[PDB]
Amino acid sequence: HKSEVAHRFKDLGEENFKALVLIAFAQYLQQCPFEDHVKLVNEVTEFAKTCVADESAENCDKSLHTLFGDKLCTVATLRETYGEMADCCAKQEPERNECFLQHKDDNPNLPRLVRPEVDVMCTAFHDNEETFLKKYLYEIARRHPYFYAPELLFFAKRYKAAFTECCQAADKAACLLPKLDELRDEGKASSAKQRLKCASLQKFGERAFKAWAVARLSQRFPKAEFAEVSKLVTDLTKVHTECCHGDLLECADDRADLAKYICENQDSISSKLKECCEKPLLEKSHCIAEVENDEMPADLPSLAADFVESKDVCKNYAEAKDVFLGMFLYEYARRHPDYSVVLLLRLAKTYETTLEKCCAAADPHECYAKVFDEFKPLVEEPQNLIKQNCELFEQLGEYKFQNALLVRYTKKVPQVSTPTLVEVSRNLGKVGSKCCKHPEAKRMPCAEDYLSVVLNQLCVLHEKTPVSDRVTKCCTESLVNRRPCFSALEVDETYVPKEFNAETFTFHADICTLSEKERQIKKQTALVELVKHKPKATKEQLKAVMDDFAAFVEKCCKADDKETCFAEEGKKLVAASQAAL
Numbered sequence: 419h420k421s422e423v424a425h426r427f428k429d430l431g432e433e434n435f436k437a438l439v440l441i442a443f444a445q446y447l448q449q450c451p452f453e454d455h456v457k458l459v460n461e462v463t464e465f466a467k468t469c470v471a472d473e474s475a476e477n478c479d480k481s482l483h484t485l486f487g488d489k490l491c492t493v494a495t496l497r498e499t500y501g502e503m504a505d506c507c508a509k510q511e512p513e514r515n516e517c518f519l520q521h522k523d524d525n526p527n528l529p530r531l532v533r534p535e536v537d538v539m540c541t542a543f544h545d546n547e548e549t550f551l552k553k554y555l556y557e558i559a560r561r562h563p564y565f566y567a568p569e570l571l572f573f574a575k576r577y578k579a580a581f582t583e584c585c586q587a588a589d590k591a592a593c594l595l596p597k598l599d600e601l602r603d604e605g606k607a608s609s610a611k612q613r614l615k616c617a618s619l620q621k622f623g624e625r626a627f628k629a630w631a632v633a634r635l636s637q638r639f640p641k642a643e644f645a646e647v648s649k650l651v652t653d654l655t656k657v658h659t660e661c662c663h664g665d666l667l668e669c670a671d672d673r674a675d676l677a678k679y680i681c682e683n684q685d686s687i688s689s690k691l692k693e694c695c696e697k698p699l700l701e702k703s704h705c706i707a708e709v710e711n712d713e714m715p716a717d718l719p720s721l722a723a724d725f726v727e728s729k730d731v732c733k734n735y736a737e738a739k740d741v742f743l744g745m746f747l748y749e750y751a752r753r754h755p756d757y758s759v760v761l762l763l764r765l766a767k768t769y770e771t772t773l774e775k776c777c778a779a780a781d782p783h784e785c786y787a788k789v790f791d792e793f794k795p796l797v798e799e800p801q802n803l804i805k806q807n808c809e810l811f812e813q814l815g816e817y818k819f820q821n822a823l824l825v826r827y828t829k830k831v832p833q834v835s836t837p838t839l840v841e842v843s844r845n846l847g848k849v850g851s852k853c854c855k856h857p858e859a860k861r862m863p864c865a866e867d868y869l870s871v872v873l874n875q876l877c878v879l880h881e882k883t884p885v886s887d888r889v890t891k892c893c894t895e896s897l898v899n900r901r902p903c904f905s906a907l908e909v910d911e912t913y914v915p916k917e918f919n920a921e922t923f924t925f926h927a928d929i930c931t932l933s934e935k936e937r938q939i940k941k942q943t944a945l946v947e948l949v950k951h952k953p954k955a956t957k958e959q960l961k962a963v964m965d966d967f968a969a970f971v972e973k974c975c976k977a978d979d980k981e982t983c984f985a986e987e988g989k990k991l992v993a994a995s996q997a998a999l
């Protein structure tokens with residue numbers, strides 16, 4: 419163990435090494451062009467083969483942090499381009515790498531990536547596959563400097579497979595564009611989960627991150643003993659502290675070590691783990707982070723013995739409050755993989771709250787005796803919400819279910835901008851389509867997975883351009899209460915109806931030539947403004963107006979001379995709609 423570069427080259431292989439080196443330079447030097455990075459990648463690879471041949475060669479005994487920072491500081495354009503970042507070069511290496519990380523620009527000033535036409539992509543992919551995917555790996559990495567490099571590499575290989583299958587197909591667009599749409603969405607979703615996990619650790623505390631994670635790991639590894647989950651939670655906390663700080667190497671070493679440990683101690687952890695532990699280094703931690711929940715042991719008793727019926731429950735809890743709440747959490751969670759994590763955390767917080775009041779009252783035992791009965795209004799709320807919404811989703815379809823959510827949320831918070839209202843109703847409509855296809859025992863974790871990110875994205879938007887104190891209130895009470903708080907918002911009785919604007923309800927025949935997607939957004943936009951202009955309208959009245967509108971679209975798109983219709987019937991639909999309301 420003499421050369422860090424040599425070691426990492428042998429472990430990753432040359433292809434994976436070159437890609438990771440490209441990503442890491444793209445994340446630090448986000449304004450240099452692609453060909454500057456390619457030159458750096460090749461110089462670093464040529465040097466890396468020098469060390470594979472002879473670990474004693476000059477410079478091979480250097481730290482990777484040292485080698486990386488030295489190559490950063492050879493860039494002659496550095497001060498002209500990045501300014502203050504060039505002053506990091508005057509430092510010695512502990513502070514130098516720290517100085518470089520401070521100057522990472524998440525959310526930089528780059529134009530949005532345009533998806534080219536399908537045949538443009540396939541010709542480019544065929545004509546120079548490597549530079550096509552690599553230029554795009556550069557564009558993505560420089561836009562997401564904190565995105566964990568190996569995972570970015572895993573997205574790239576999914577893109578490669580989609581172009582290899584689809585570009586040799588009969589209908590390229592039909593094959594490819596669903597695969598690119600799923601990949602785009604999962605890419606944005608991963609970025610947001612990571613920004614969410616890091617915000618939990620930064621603002622709310624290491625404690626809440628361990629609460630989460632105990633819950634999740636106990637659902638995932640229900641056969642494991644509490645001490646083994648505590649160990650894993652400790653390791654996870656370090657891993658994610660490091661990765662949030664932005665230092666790629668230490669983050670990745672930590673996840674590798676964690677992956678190695680889990681794979682050796684398979685027997686104390688989970689059975690559904692041999693597949694992930696068969697795969698190469700790069701992929702194992704990623705694979706484990708997603709592994710299916712193991713099956714719980716069949717012989718599991720009520721928790722009531724350990725956690726309500728004991729005397730020596732207030733003593734046990736006072737001896738180590740967080741270890742005891744963790745054991746409660748661990749036991750509830752391994753029994754309920756059908757629960758969301760946040761639901762298990764509400765149960766845990768409820769138990770804590772009562773032990774705190776009851777362990778210092780007259781008789782404890784009879785004070786906290788009916789404690790599990792407090793769980794049931796908490797469990798049934800998410801369950802009922804999902805049952806009702808999946809029934810609704812199956813009656814309407816996805817699009818008409820979006821419209822249903824659109825009216826609900828506009829009435830709840832009519833001060834939100836119309837595009838945001840449309841975007842989240844549409845987003846949550848697709849959450850119905852995906853999660854309601856699960857059986858009931860799996861709808862709640864599926865729903866939480868999408869809602870927590872939608873809700874955190876919403877809250878971050880809102881702190882920027884705020885609009886409603888009630889939204890602020892949900893976005894800054896507990897992270898755990900965020901979804902129920904939103905669900906509990908009632909229709910806004912204070913809102914002054916937005917004043918009628920004739921153009922907002924003026925339609926032209928271009929609506930017949932638009933895609934279904936853009937037709938629906940044009941119409942979903944008009945629905946929001948209709949509810950914002952008449953927030954008192956009933957479900958019956960709105961369905962009266964909406965049906966009349968869909969007969970005005972069909973009549974005027976079926977008609978000899980389209981655009982005189984849209985203005986003539988349009989005058990009539992508005993006048994009659996203003997009158998029914």
Ligand SMILES: CCCCCCCCCCCCCCCC(=O)O
Binds near residue numbers: 442670671699700704
């Ligand atoms: C000359 C310095 C260049 C920097 C070298 C590139 C550093 C990237 C190394 C990443 C190793 C990742 C191993 C996989 C770990 C995991 O996610 O389980």
Ligand SMILES: CCCCCCCCCCCCCCCC(=O)O
Binds near residue numbers: 625632740763770896
């Ligand atoms: C291995 C033990 C780790 C520690 C686990 C402690 C569990 C905490 C239980 C209370 C849940 C609190 C949820 C976070 C936000 C809050 O405090 O309101």
Ligand SMILES: CCCCCCCCCCCCCCCC(=O)O
Binds near residue numbers: 827879901
């Ligand atoms: C930028 C500000 C945006 C604020 C968003 C307000 C629009 C409502 C969003 C509700 C999402 C949470 C869904 C909870 C489930 C339910 O519908 O009961």
